[PDB]
Symmetry: D2
Subunit: 124 residues, 4 copies
């Protein structure tokens, strides 16, 4: 059992109103679905990732990350986002992330292929 397996598993919301539904496995796996409130997206997309299933016990956060490729049965935005961040437990648990969204572009446009941002997820 990962230390924060129960704390991570569940439904999370970010500041854009997107919905992140995840299950943390005892082995460090993250599996679930993502629904983005913004951009070229509709409904749920598959996500997978990893988390540190034996974090430090000195008050540090729990490192994790996951990926969504923005293809599902409704749309294909030819892009992928990875979120990299940490789970912070407690009364108001949070997942604090930064993210990289890469679009599949021609070689001449590679310089403008990647957006960077930051999302904060909470359980309410």
């Amino acid at each position: 059992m990962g230390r924060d397996e129960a704390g991570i598993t569940g439904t999370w919301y970010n500041q854009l109103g997107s919905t992140f539904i995840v299950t943390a496995g005892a082995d460090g796996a993250l599996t679930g679905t993502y629904e983005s409130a913004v951009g070229n997206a509709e409904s749920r997309y598959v996500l997978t990732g990893r988390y540190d299933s034996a974090p430090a016990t000195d008050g540090s956060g729990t490192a994790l990350g996951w990926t969504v490729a923005w293809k599902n049965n409704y749309r294909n935005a030819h892009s992928a986002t990875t979120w990299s961040g940490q789970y912070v437990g407690g009364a108001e648990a949070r997942i604090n992330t930064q993210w990289l969204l890469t679009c599949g572009f021609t070689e001449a446009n590679a310089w403008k292929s990647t957006l960077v941002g930051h999302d904060t997820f909470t359980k309410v």
Copy 2:
């Protein structure tokens, strides 16, 4: 069958001499192992990710991403890296990425928790 399922599946090397061994599934899954030539790492770590399994056919790259949590049976660096990028096919295939490495830190050190970099993977 994903368009670039065969082109992605296999063993990749980046400019640091790290080894990225991946299988692309027809459904958009990436599964495999990562071995980093640098940092607080030894041997292979589980990785999972996603890729666009029906990319555009106008010469654009194929968007993808994956995560490694830096825990295995030898070490735990209490951190996770996500790579976000695109697969570029052809005679000298490449996966061009940018990445975010987040460490699990205390709340007071969250400002210095995340490194950013860029890795280029080739098949030789």
Copy 3:
């Protein structure tokens, strides 16, 4: 006179309690001092940057950026931070930024040379 010359000029505070004191020139220059509440820093450091002195008038923010090299008469942390972001006017004006902190490192450690984060500045 830049459109937001008066709105930008002045004293700003971020969520870490750092102090950003800036003057915007009519030509697009930013000049001032930065005092960081965290890290290897003490007192004020010179900053310089640029801003869009004729922004759009459709409600968009005003793009800007600036650099601090972390050397002053007290300390030298052999590093530089650049903030890239936008000034958002109104009752609760804000400068929303993302930033890159690069340390001068040996060639073998270049992969871990750059931190990424995000700072929000307000006038109170």
Copy 4:
């Protein structure tokens, strides 16, 4: 006199074929012009920045950064780029950077306001 004042001052080119013309001052100032080979840009734009004028002498690079706001007498792309990186001296001197390009956008589009990339500058 900054340690790398002479090594930095001059004309640099990146992998896109952009031209970075800079003067390093003894006080740590960077001043000059930037001409981008790509994007919504034409001719030269003002740049300003800072560099560590007393770097370590253990083989580490010299940290620096600079900003361009993409307004000049020809065009205004309502955006700013900051480059954060290090000067690496020697036979084939280099400035290795990562950069953040922020567009002035409405509040609803702030999530897609910032591109991230990496540029390598050389003297030839």
